[PDB]
Amino acid sequence: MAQLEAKVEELLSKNWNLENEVARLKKLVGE
Amino acid sequence: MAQLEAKVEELLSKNWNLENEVARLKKLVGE
Fold first, then answer.
1. Which residue in A9, B4, B10, B21 is deepest, having the highest Cβ count within 10 Å?
2. Residue among A10, A12, A15 with most chain B CBs within 10 A, to mutate
3. Contacts of B7 (CB under 8 A, 6+ apart)
């Protein structure tokens, strides 16, 4: 598999972690 | 240009918007 696939996977994982962080912050503040 | 490029661009832009949101939240709370 091309190392390019690994970089796209990293971008997806980072996206998910950011979204989940934001989701947890929304729950904390009641949003 | 392949529509695939547009999707990767969307992923990058979303990543940037999430990071910038988190960065602004850190500034708000003093982190």
1. B21
2. A15
3. none
Experimental technique of record: X-ray
Contact between B22 and A23 under an 8 Å Cβ cutoff? The reply is: no
CA distances from B5 to A7, B8, B12 (A): 14, 5, 11
Write down the residue that tokens 């996206």 correspond to: A15
Asked if B20 reaches chain A (Cβ–Cβ under 8 Å), the answer is: no
B9, B10, B18: best to mutate for the A interface, most A CBs within 10 A: B18
For the purposes of burial, counting CB atoms within 10 Å of the CB of B21, is it exposed (0-12), middle (13-18) or buried (19 or more)? middle
Q: Which domain holds residue A24?
A: 1-31
